[PDB]
């Protein structure tokens, strides 16, 4: 999580955007957020999808400065879309979507994992010794 | 987050295991955890690095059944490594490491995002109508 | 239309907000936009009302700098709410609402009036002579 | 935008007429137009100011039926003046003035706002679903 400038090529849908990142075009996918579909080849457009797209679309279009929190490993999804936290003038796009009920936080095992970490810290195990 | 079998080939580090997935050799990076490394690009061998490596190796080599579970989003990194929650006889290596203080939970904006999702649910917005 | 700083006291609904304007609290109404209702004493909450409120609410809450385009005549509605164009970090709130289909532009005779003005300009009448 | 009768009392300027509205004396400021003034706070008598004043006066004094139409939003200013579209025998004084080049249409963000509303309608967003 180190911000880096990017510029908008074009907004694609609720959770994907095409940006110029490092002098090269790149389609980014919003980390940890799943918005309803609009352009998905398997199940079409879902309820609130259009509204989700419009939100993301205008958020990155009205923005003067766009930045991305894209890991040094440049992780991508199965379609080659780079995952990141996108900020429209410092406001996080993934959170803004989630807060308006236009995206759902994706299911991960983090909550469970930190539960364990706290316990290992308590017991002051190895790293936490 | 669907589980799939995989056959061990070789443990590479505390955070990386080479598996035979669907007939093809594949190297996996453990999701949501950061392990001290024996193979750090700049540092080389880190403190507790040998410990986490020995742990993953033992945990993985003594399992009868290995399984990988993928994040619906991030699936691969720029080095070609798959990203997964790996299981050794029903026990997650990711969590095993964290519990022993041999790995930390990766930084993420999930906690923040759930806070807002909870607010959205509460206010009965769009997808939560 | 000259911008002036204001600070957020609290967001009220889709089209009203309470701001500190000139060292005094003031409830502002968004000019030319009518959003569905939520807190209206005569007909309750309307469809898309909650969503409208959440939009305006977070727009002015996540904003570092808030400004208003409030006329020197300090025009108010029947409930004493001052009408203005509100900007959340330079982004106009009234337009953002309208663009997401959360507000409708209010009906005025302006389009008709400018039609006439153009004709008076053509004929280079009095002022335009 | 509902019309109501009003009885003339006295014309005050090109942009202001004192009317007897609902049994009470009320001074009205013409909506959406800016007229050169004979009674300008800083300038005093402006060019074409006498002309617009004479125009409003004649237009208003020779009408049999006067009516005021209000903006559903802005209704009063800090000086206590009501804001309205005034009609003299079915003819709007506001438009009459503009047509003769004796008044200009006030600056507004309505054109911009309709542009976006059209985009929202087209995309079938929320209220336009």
Curated annotation (Swiss-Prot), chains A, B, C, D:
Catalytic machinery residues: 29, 37, 81
Region named Disordered: 109-129
Gene label: nuc
Compartments, as annotated in UniProt: Secreted
Feature: compositional bias, Basic and acidic residues: 109-125
Protein name per its UniProtKB record: Nuclease A
Annotated binding of Ca(2+), by residue: 15, 34-35
